[PDB]
Amino acid sequence: VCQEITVPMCRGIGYNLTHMPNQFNHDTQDEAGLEVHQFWPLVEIQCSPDLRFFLCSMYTPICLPDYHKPLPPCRSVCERAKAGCSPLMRQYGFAWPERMSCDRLPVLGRDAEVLCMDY
Amino acid sequence: PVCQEITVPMCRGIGYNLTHMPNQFNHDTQDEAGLEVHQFWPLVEIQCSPDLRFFLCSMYTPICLPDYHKPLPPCRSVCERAKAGCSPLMRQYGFAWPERMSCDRLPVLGRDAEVLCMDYE
Ligand SMILES: *[C@@H]1O[C@H](CO[C@@H]2O[C@@H](C)[C@@H](O)[C@@H](O)[C@@H]2O)[C@@H](O[C@@H]2O[C@@H](C)[C@@H](O)[C@@H](O)[C@@H]2O)[C@H](O[C@@H]2O[C@@H](C)[C@@H](O)[C@@H](O)[C@@H]2O)[C@H]1NC(C)=O
Numbered sequence: 218v219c220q221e222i223t224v225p226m227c228r229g230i231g232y233n234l235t236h237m238p239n240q241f242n243h244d245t246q247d248e249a250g251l252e253v254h255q256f257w258p259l260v261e262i263q264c265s266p267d268l269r270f271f272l273c274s275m276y277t278p279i280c281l282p283d284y285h286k287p288l289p290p291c292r293s294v295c296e297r298a299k300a301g302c303s304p305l306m307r308q309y310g311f312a313w314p315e316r317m318s319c320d321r322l323p324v325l326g327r328d329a330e331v332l333c334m335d336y
Numbered sequence: 337p338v339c340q341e342i343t344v345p346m347c348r349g350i351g352y353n354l355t356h357m358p359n360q361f362n363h364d365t366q367d368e369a370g371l372e373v374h375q376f377w378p379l380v381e382i383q384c385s386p387d388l389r390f391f392l393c394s395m396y397t398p399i400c401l402p403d404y405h406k407p408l409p410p411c412r413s414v415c416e417r418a419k420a421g422c423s424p425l426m427r428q429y430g431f432a433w434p435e436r437m438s439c440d441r442l443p444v445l446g447r448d449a450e451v452l453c454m455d456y457e
Pocket residue numbers: 221232233
């Protein structure tokens with residue numbers, strides 16, 4: 218079933234409801250939220266206007282009551298966030314996370330049946 | 337008085353390095369100011385708005401310029417972005433958007449050419 222998002226940084230990004238487990242197999246929003254919290258300095262610095270939405274689209278993925286297919290962000294969302302933010306991360310010794318590699322995400326409109334989220 | 341370097345930890349590295357006491361809250365010291373603005377620190381880590389830190393610091397540790405010799409407020413638009421981002425969460429958690437940082441107390445950028453204000457990013 219769908220639950221109201223309780224991860225504070227992921228409220229106000231365009232949708233209200235999520236469902237667990239997410240694609241990292243976090244079992245609760247609490248677990249997901251403790252991890253995504255670590256990205257707050259990157260979000261504050263605004264290296265990319267897509268980052269916040271992108272992070273939330275994976276940590277608290279959108280839930281629709283009638284839809285049971287997973288709705289990842291589109292690859293393009295990831296690409297923009299990565300292009301904006303990875304240089305700054307690299308500058309702090311952080312590589313772009315392995316679990317966030319964009320090639321794992323569907324391309325917008327490539328497959329009619331495979332929907333995804335574009336900001 | 338007096339153009340002093342900013343010591344409040346939250347407000348270091350926000351884009352200007354100097355402030356002046358007292359502020360609009362009648363804090364006589366940065367230590368007094370810091371104790372209050374640091375109560376908002378969890379909201380900064382929550383990142384309901386990227387503009388929140390700058391907006392708060394522009395109030396509590398206002399910019400001091402050796403060339404202006406008067407207070408320089410954030411533009412209304414800075415407040416409006418912080419508030420649009422963070423008011424919903426503050427209201428949900430039971431904390432009203434405080435009246436001291438009402439956006440209608442701030443100048444709209446360029447509405448009167450002689451009334452300056454700081455915008456950012
Ligand atoms: C997204 O959620 C908004 C907040 O809902 C409230 O908080 C959540 C966490 C739950 O506890 C809900 O049970 C609460 O209603 C919701 O907006 C609210 O709507 C009214 C009742 C009032 O509380 C407002 O202050 C809230 O913002 C959103 O609902 C949409 O937008 C609002 C502005 C109205 O127009 C609604 O009709 C809309 O559906 C909701 N968004 C969606 C798409 O459901």
